[PDB]
Amino acid sequence: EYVEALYQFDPQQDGDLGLKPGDKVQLLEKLSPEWYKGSCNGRTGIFPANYVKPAF
């Protein structure tokens, strides 16, 4: 499963996966309704679920 970032998430804590709009992210785990774990361009971390939409 892959998702696409719609909004810029600026990371603030170690383990956060920063996102720029258009970035496609491999979804590794849905931790809760509010936080996902994923990978993008070689980086792995967590990000809020409402920054992204389905891609494939």
From Swiss-Prot:
Q: Tell what triggers its expression.
A: By heat shock. Can thereby reach physiological protein levels high enough to promote prion-formation.
Residues forming the SH3 domain are 1-56
Posttranslational modification, per the record?
Ubiquitinated by RSP5. Ubiquitination reduces the protein abundance and its prion-inducing ability.
Compartments where located: Cytoplasm; Nucleus; Cytoplasm, Cytoskeleton, Actin patch
Bilayer-spanning residue ranges: none
Per the UniProt entry, the effect of W35S is:
Abolishes interaction with LAS17, but not with SUP35. Blocks colocalization with actin, aggregation, and prion-inducing ability
The location annotated for the cross-link Glycyl lysine isopeptide (Lys-Gly) (interchain with G-Cter in ubiquitin) is K24
Q: What is this protein's function per UniProt?
A: Overproduction promotes the de novo induction of the [PSI+] prion form of SUP35. The prion-inducing effect depends on the association with the actin cytoskeleton. Also implicated in prion maintenance during heat stress.
Q: What else is known?
A: Present with 2190 molecules/cell in log phase SD medium.
Quaternary state and interactors:
Interacts with LAS17, RSP5 and SUP35.
- Domain description: The PY motif is recognized directly by the WW domains of RSP5.
The family this protein is said to belong to: Belongs to the LSB1 family.
The name of this protein is [PSI+] inducibility protein 3
Question: Native species of this protein?
Answer: Saccharomyces cerevisiae (strain ATCC 204508 / S288c) (Baker's yeast)
Q: State the gene name recorded for this protein.
A: PIN3
